[PDB]
């Protein structure tokens, strides 16, 4: 086992907002001292591209090198399902290692977003759970956040996406708030970003009624 | 190179029900045709034990073999946190490989179980989502099922456990039913099995209210 290669996608948010900078990152670890030269070749749908930004090798504490190449992707290319190939050549290798990444193949499907209030039986407790259910989406690349009054609500966790029986995905996000904030009629909102949403955004709010 | 070893815990349900048979599983992959024969030794807190069963092997489509030992464990041994060690010996591998596993450590904490009805917004669809929020539990080993009129309801998916900010875990389980069944006022219940519950079991009901 000479070097190993890991190829990382853009963050889901980066491909959905034109203001952001989506990237694919090709990382090569366990490059030896005896064969330290690394060459990257990058292909987009199998055609070679020359605009990647490759950093100089960095020696790790375990006396091997780590080398990183970063390819900027166009938002619409990623969303049109183009395939990104990183080919890594090194003299310790019997053959160059190739890795490919893309958005998961399939027709995109819009997330249905539903907000659910706390159970009345949780209403004895000091802190209470506000739920956002996001279902029927494809592919599973998605981002979820909570706000109240224009401001990020930081006490939330989101489940990974889960493959549903019809082939789409779902998840839940849980915001935890002090009981009293919920009593006071505060409006909380769950926001979702996904390629199949109009403007890649929807928001759903939830309040005591 | 040679074979490599992966050691797997019992299913949560199996350890919590005395009628069930919990098993620790030692899976050996990359076993070649040229070097075929694998030995297993098994240990429970260092004391060698002798109850253990090798499965008939599988030929993988990469032309390597997949060999499996299965050790039956006592429910209370697993729950009291005893260590299970799998020592794999293959004389075309530099030395014997040992792997060890046990229950996650720390004070078990009781799950809080809340059922949530479908969103008002969801009530215009043909199928609706019944939600069971299970939070505050430790360790993350748990089982969740659904029933109606003492009969299993099978069209559900449960998220993996998620680490909450207090070091406990939560998850959600989603049952999908025909809106018809829901509107007619059928009772549905979410069953939860976890070591910290009395009798390792609780159920919460959900009907049109
Ligand atoms: C020598 O040391 C080096 C360096 O390590 C460092 O130094 C040593 C001495 C120690 O101090 C050590 O602690 C230090 O870290 C060792 O190098 C490591 O080698 C291992 C393998 O041996 C690598 O393991 C893989 O890791 C992947 C995840 O890596 C990320 O997350 C970890 C922590 O969780 C980080 O440490 C990494 O840096 C990676 O972090 C990610 O980096 C991306 C690129 O920068 C980020 O994306 C970019 O981020 C920016 C902003 O941040 C933008 O957003 C960009 O647009 C964006 O692209 C990303 O944000 C960041 N994430 C996080 C969370 O930080 C694992 O994915 C991978 O698992 C796969 O492979 C396994 C087999 O190898 C397999 O078992 C797994 O199942 C998994 O398989 C994949 O599964 C999916 C399906 O689910 C499939 O899609 C894939 O096909 C499939 N892949 C397969 C089959 O290959 C590995 O575990 C490790 O990353 C690496 N470290 C570093 C730092 O590079 C080296 O091992 C040592 N050597 C020896 C001999 O000791
Ligand atoms: C030749 O073929 C075989 C088999 O081929 C495979 O299957 C067939 C049918 C085809 O579809 C193929 O396309 C497919 O490739 C290959 O053998 C595979 O080899 C890899 C390693 O190279 C193994 O990966 C490990 O997997 C375990 C988890 O595996 C479970 O889940 C899999 C589904 O995701 C499932 O396939 C497995 O069978 C297994 O399933 C469980 O099995 C038990 C008993 O049957 C059962 O009770 C469970 O219910 C069941 N569970 C589920 C969910 O299904 C994974 O844990 C390993 O990850 C660790 O190690 C990695 C390094 O390899 C590392 O990157 C990870 O981070 C992780 O590391 C650990 O992390 C923990 C926790 O964080 C930490 O404490 C530790 O420090 C750390 N430990 C270590 C040791 O590092 C790992 O990924 C495959 O299981 C295996 N496939 C099968 C079917 O057995 C073989 O590679 C091929 N060979 C060649 C040369 O090509």
Author numbering:
A (entry chain A), B (entry chain B): 239 to 447
What's the publication's text?
The antibody Fc translates pathogen recognition into immune activation, but the regulation of this crucial signal involves a delicate balance dependent on structural details. The binding of Fc to various types of FcR cellular receptors is crucial and is sensitive to variations in the glycan that is attached to the conserved Asn300 (the actual sequence number varies owing to differing CDR lengths, and many structures call this residue Asn297). Other key binding partners include C1q, which initiates the complement reaction, and neonatal FcRn, which facilitates the transport of maternal antibodies into newborns. The Fc dyad is the symmetry axis of the entire antibody, although the extreme flexibility of the hinge region means that the Fabs normally adopt unique and asymmetric conformations.
To provide a scientific description of this material and to facilitate its application, we report the crystal structure of its Fc fragment. This is now the highest resolution structure available with its specific sequence in the common orthorhombic form. The glycans include all atoms consistent with the biophysically characterized principal glycoform G1F/G0F (i.e. the A-chain glycan has nine sugar groups including one fucose and one terminal galactose, while the B chain has only eight, lacking galactose). The two glycans interact through one hydrogen bond between mannose hydroxyls across the molecular dyad. Although the Fc is chemically symmetric or very nearly so, most Fc crystal structures are asymmetric. In the common orthorhombic crystal form in the present study, the asymmetric unit contains a complete Fc molecule and the two chains differ. The differences are greatest in the CH2 domains, and in most structures one subunit is better ordered (with lower temperature factors) than the other. The crystals gave significantly better diffraction from the A chain relative to the B chain (the mean isotropic B values are 47 and 66 Å2, respectively).
